Symmetry: D2
Amino acid sequence: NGRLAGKRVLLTNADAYMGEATVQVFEEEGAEVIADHTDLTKVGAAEEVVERAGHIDVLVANFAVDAHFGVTVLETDEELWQTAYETIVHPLHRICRAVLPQFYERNKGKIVVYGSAAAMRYQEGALAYSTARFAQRGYVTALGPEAARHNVNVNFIAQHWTQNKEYFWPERIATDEFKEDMARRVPLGRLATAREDALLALFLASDESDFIVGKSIEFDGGWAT
Amino acid sequence: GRLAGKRVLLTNADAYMGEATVQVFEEEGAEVIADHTDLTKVGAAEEVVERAGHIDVLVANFAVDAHFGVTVLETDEELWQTAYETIVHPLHRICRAVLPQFYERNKGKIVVYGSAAAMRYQEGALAYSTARFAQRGYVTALGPEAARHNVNVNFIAQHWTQNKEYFWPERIATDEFKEDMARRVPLGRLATAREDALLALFLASDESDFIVGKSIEFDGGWAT
Amino acid sequence: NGRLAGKRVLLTNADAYMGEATVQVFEEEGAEVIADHTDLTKVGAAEEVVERAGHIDVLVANFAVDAHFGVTVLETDEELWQTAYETIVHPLHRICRAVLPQFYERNKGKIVVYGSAAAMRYQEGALAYSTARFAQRGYVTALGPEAARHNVNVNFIAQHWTQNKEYFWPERIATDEFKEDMARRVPLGRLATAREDALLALFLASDESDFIVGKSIEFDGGWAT
Amino acid sequence: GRLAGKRVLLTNADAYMGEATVQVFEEEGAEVIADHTDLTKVGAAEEVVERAGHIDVLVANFAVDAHFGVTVLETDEELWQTAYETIVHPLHRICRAVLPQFYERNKGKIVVYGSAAAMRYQEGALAYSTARFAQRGYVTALGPEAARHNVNVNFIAQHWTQNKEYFWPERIATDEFKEDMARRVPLGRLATAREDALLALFLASDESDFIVGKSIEFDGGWAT
Ligand SMILES: [Cl-]
Ligand SMILES: [Cl-]
Ligand SMILES: [Cl-]
Ligand SMILES: [Cl-]
């Protein structure tokens, strides 16, 4: 059988960010993927999504927001700042808090967060976004060891240079300027495919990774090494 | 003195590490503007800076109840939001307010009193830890941007340091606390608030211009 | 349809440390495992092993030495200090330098190092050993991005609380101090089995992990989180 | 002075960051024992300490040619061994020699001039990086052990700092160097040797007793 045989996976914002490749990889490995499209910025929405989903073995916390490439600290206004937190930080705790009771009842569970390498090292021109990804990384760091006492794994994929619409859309990655910047800063010298990212998520969602607790795994071609 | 002629803007001066900052920095010749304005209000940071006038050093001193022992399932919406409202959003407001004059002079200093809960897992302090992580991320992301203007932004990742918010005199006398500290703090003691302010003094002084966007662990070895 | 189908894996010190589970897990996924038992502390031995081996797709750098638990800084004499470096540091460069030419020729390769969480954070009473593991972590950090330009992945497993004879022999597990660490310092509250560690190595040796470059992956039940 | 009445043992005082250490530490009242002994020799460290007598601070100043540009395939046995022989094994010899008197007094200070190559990938410096990582590991592992005796051991992870071994005048004078440096260093300049010594001064002073087994990145933001 497949590496997620029998498992049911709740995927947030399934059309956005890394959702499409998650569905493809996880379904090929036998999982039933609940592809949710609910806006989890609404208070109370997370508990409703979880109640409607039924039995959940794996939560894939898939959240993204415009990074506002090139916007400076002085141009990072109140609304831009707040929107980073409203979009990817507060919903992360809402959805995790909603799924953890059934994980705790069964003394088993899996949470995979698609995050950012901007939560690990300086990424130029993405200030509010970086701080919000740091907050996500902190949530995994703080919740991870707490949830591990209930045999629940929580882990953070610190991705960069990976194909997606929000940060590496086809038009952006085609220019000469982008290509020279990627060759300078990415040791592997290429972008990751979305599938490669979902293959790491697959490892972290599977029962092959039970000993990995509260970790940030840098998925960035060597950028932050 | 090591801060001779310098003017220092200190937020929430009666809270957290404020008192020791005044004492140490004034000892070294600084004029310390001991502000007590609530920076959770939009617009307050700009008014504080305009009234302060010339600022050489910003000490970003923010604290919030960590709610020690509260689990993930009991971290409700209001507790979570209050952590960010109290120590995260105001940090960008006050830094964004001081940077313009630093950029005109191509010189500035920002020191953030943070937490070692932004570096490693600290039991029973969930929302608080994530808010300190956000502050650490602000220093990590702003640091290299501001350094192009010769402005230093750095983060003190403190733990086991005397203060009212986290190590108030009652809590440090329990049996569980003393052997907690003995087991997990290699140095075997709490830091004085003065010792913390002496690190902030180094990072606020012109002896530390090459330190950019760094998290300095001030924890008696806890996170080593 | 094994995840290492068609691959040939050179495993050092194959009976020691993490070698036996590596053989079992990798062979179940279709790999041919060249299980070497050569003493690589001897200059020249690494190139001779690699020449004899023929075509290599994956190097598993499996090195261990007595940690000398409880030996203090003042009791760490010249011989004990040198032996840590001779046993797990110098051989690591020799065997990697020996394998890299054929990886570079094919613009493809995989190196997985079984290291230690002592390379990440303070571990009580294992001084010379910790510094030698830090040196191994440094080797992965420094080599990783250099080798990635040739599409070669080099990664470090920073393990702790994992089944092996060298560090978790039966009498240690029976001590009050170990039980205290499992209650207080290991969030998951158990040892990993060697299988689980080999499953992380399998991921890092497979073509599912080509975007992972020069990383230290903490395999420690949450201990360093 | 901030080191008034202190005696400081400085290794390899002619090399690396030694000259700036002498200048800054003597300005602050220290007596600096400027040792030039070859500590790759077994037995030498204990004789250095015996001759020095009472030591309050050890500044572990070790350097070796980084062999910039030499690839993994050209890092031969001799190049590799020389890195460890020059900056790794002597570090334990000299710390082991000074710790006994620190332990009698329950007080001591060790500052290691290391490298930011012990923190993140530095291109073209393979053997050197791994040897600096080993130094960082020594501080990380010894720090908490020594802190039990109120001894501080800390690591300066420096880069882009003026010295003869890595950033010598002829190397840093060219336009190619200055252009590459402006791209990789957020602060956009090299540090002076004195600035590095001012960090060592803080870590050697009694203002830094709560800092235990830490790596402080001294690199203008390079590794941030
Ligand atoms: Cl990405
Ligand atoms: Cl504190
Ligand atoms: Cl282990
Ligand atoms: Cl340097």
